[PDB]
Design a protein around this ligand. Structure first.
Ligand SMILES: [Mg+2]
Ligand SMILES: [Mg+2]
Ligand SMILES: [Mn+2]
Ligand SMILES: [Mn+2]
Ligand SMILES: [O-]
Length: 386
């Protein structure tokens, strides 16, 4: 039971299981992993694929020959295992040159470098099969108010994404972009801090259809937001191009716990939503095995990500299939929510005395919503008490 297979579409970043455990107050607790070892270990755990930043696959500053060497060994591991690469991204955050940003660095020469670094990796991503190219603008933002003129920075951010869209259009690539929001860390405040801000920004790009979001559980929770609700808004907009699954224990530094950890009920409601919406993309884990763990704990934590998704999938399906739940949803008027409010139009609504003049507000108000019974059925299903 709960054994993942490639059919389940689980993916992991090289940098997840490969995290050496450096944190702001700590040196590495684990050795670097060879990407080939990661591909092989994740395949044996039942993953479907991996993702990478450029600099996870090819050490920064590699010569062209070294580059090609790293890419070849990786492609041979992918090919041997049947592991895929559904998504890739650029590291525009680790190198000190990016200390004020990539695309929105105040220094123009840095902005241009960021774009070139990204374009080089888009070409590689496409060859390896990525259908989504993620941008996490972790350095875009500020610690102080005058350091960054945010309207101007948004002009630069738009200019960068529009140039990338021109490039992929020119090349005839299939690949779409996904912006990964985060509210803070490592900048005091990060630009495009939530799913909403990223969705809004996309609508001002030249080719909006090429851009969506890559929301991460823990990032929205760093703003105290409801991650299932934000995913619902992304799905409503047609913009859930990819998703990052993990756990977060509240409003604090980005913990990147394994999926299921942190806010467990939010993980349940997320799975419920993804499955009823028919999301077809990768189930990607952007997580860190805690630095307390050795390599055996790395693979246990990765396995746990997948196991928890599968348990929650079972529980959510059982919840929605239960006749008792179907009845409680009706008792709570979830069916009525789906009826148009006024398909009859403005003039019919305005002439309808049952909508105002003759509406019995007190009788309506006295009708309980029955939400607590509904939620306790949900709790019982999650806990396997049904
Ligand atoms: Mg390598
Ligand atoms: Mg554009
Ligand atoms: Mn995170
Ligand atoms: Mn992420
Ligand atoms: O993350």
């Amino acid at each position: 039971s709960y054994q993942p297979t490639p059919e389940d579409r689980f993916t992991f970043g090289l940098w997840t299981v490969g995290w050496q455990g450096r944190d702001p107050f700590g040196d590495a607790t684990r050795p670097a992993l060879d990407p080939v070892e990661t591909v092989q270990r994740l395949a044996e755990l039942g993953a479907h694929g991996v993702t990478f930043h450029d600099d996870d696959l090819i050490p920064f500053g590699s010569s062209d020959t070294e580059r090609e060497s790293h890419i070849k060994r990786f492609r041979q591991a992918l090919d041997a295992t049947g592991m895929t690469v559904p998504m890739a991204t650029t590291n525009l955050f680790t190198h000190p040159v990016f200390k004020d940003g990539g695309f929105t660095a105040n220094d123009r020469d840095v902005r241009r470098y960021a774009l070139r670094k990204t374009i080089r990796n888009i070409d590689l991503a496409v060859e390896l099969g990525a259908k989504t190219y993620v941008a996490w603008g972790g350095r875009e933002g500020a610690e102080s108010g005058a350091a960054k003129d945010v309207r101007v920075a948004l002009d630069r951010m738009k200019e960068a994404f529009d140039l990338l869209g021109e490039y992929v259009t020119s090349q005839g690539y299939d690949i779409r972009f996904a912006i990964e929001p985060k509210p803070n860390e490592p900048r005091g405040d990060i630009l495009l801090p939530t799913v909403g801000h990223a969705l809004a920004f996309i609508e001002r790009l030249e080719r909006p259809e090429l851009y969506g979001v890559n929301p991460e559980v823990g990032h929205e929770q760093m703003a105290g937001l409801n991650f299932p609700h934000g995913i619902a808004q992304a799905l409503w907009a047609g913009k859930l191009f990819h998703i990052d699954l993990n756990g977060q224990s509240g409003i604090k530094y980005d913990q990147d716990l394994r999926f299921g950890a942190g806010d467990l009920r939010a993980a349940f409601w997320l799975v419920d939503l993804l499955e009823s919406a028919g999301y077809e993309g990768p189930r990607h884990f952007d997580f860190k095995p805690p630095r307390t763990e050795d390599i055996d704990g790395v693979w246990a934590s990765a396995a746990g990500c997948m196991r928890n998704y599968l348990i929650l999938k079972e529980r959510a399906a059982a919840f929605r299939a239960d006749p008792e739940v179907q009845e409680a949803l009706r008792a709570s008027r979830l069916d009525e929510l789906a009826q148009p409010t006024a398909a009859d139009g403005v003039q019919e609504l305005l002439a309808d005395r049952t909508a105002f003049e003759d509406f019995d507000v007190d009788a309506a108000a006295a009708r309980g919503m029955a939400f607590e019974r509904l939620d306790q059925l949900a709790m019982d299903h999650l806990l396997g008490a049904r």
